[PDB]
Write a protein that binds this ligand. Structure first.
Ligand code: HEM
Length: 137
């Protein structure tokens, strides 16, 4: 289920983080606006860049912690607040995070693995709600 999925993702986090983030950037190319440094690069190019690798893995590091601290796929208010008040996210709306979670769910549905896609989908909605409550537009 959800908790095991966390363990699975963490067992190969760098690879999962990159592949899910690339699936996000490719599904929603207009989302490349928030990452100027990534424009005009194939997936392999993006993976060569140390920053892509760095940033993305740190995103998933924190995502998995938020997932880990959730109850029944409902994240802590404190975690949502942190994500909203992060300066790197000054630009973002919950639509940005929605899209990330649609691509993550899709990724999981298309994997051969028994991910609990429905829980991640609930988790994504719950987080979007919690980001709203914590003041993200
Ligand atoms: C659960 C969801 C998310 C988590 C846990 C998260 C976490 C993080 C973390 C930890 C960093 C800092 C990494 C560093 O210091 O280098 C970061 C930076 C950033 N995040 Fe997020 N993030 C999430 C969703 C998003 C989404 C949906 C977007 C845009 C649609 C976004 C855009 C960014 C940007 C633009 C940066 C700075 C860019 C850079 O220098 O590479 N994040 N995020």
């Amino acid at each position: 289920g959800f908790k095991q999925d966390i363990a699975t993702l963490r067992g190969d986090l760098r690879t999962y983080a990159q592949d899910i983030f690339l699936a996000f950037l490719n599904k929603y190319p207009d989302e490349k606006r928030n990452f100027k440094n990534y424009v005009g690069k194939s997936d392999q190019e993006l993976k060569s860049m140390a920053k892509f690798g760095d940033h993305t893995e740190k995103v998933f590091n924190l995502m998995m912690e938020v997932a880990d601290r959730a109850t029944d796929c409902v994240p802590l208010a404190s975690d949502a607040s942190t994500l909203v008040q992060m300066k790197q996210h000054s630009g973002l709306t919950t639509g940005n995070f929605e899209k990330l979670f649609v691509a993550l769910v899709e990724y999981m549905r298309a994997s051969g693995q028994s991910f609990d896609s429905q829980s991640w989908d609930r988790f994504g909605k719950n987080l979007v709600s919690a980001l709203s409550s914590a003041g993200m537009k």
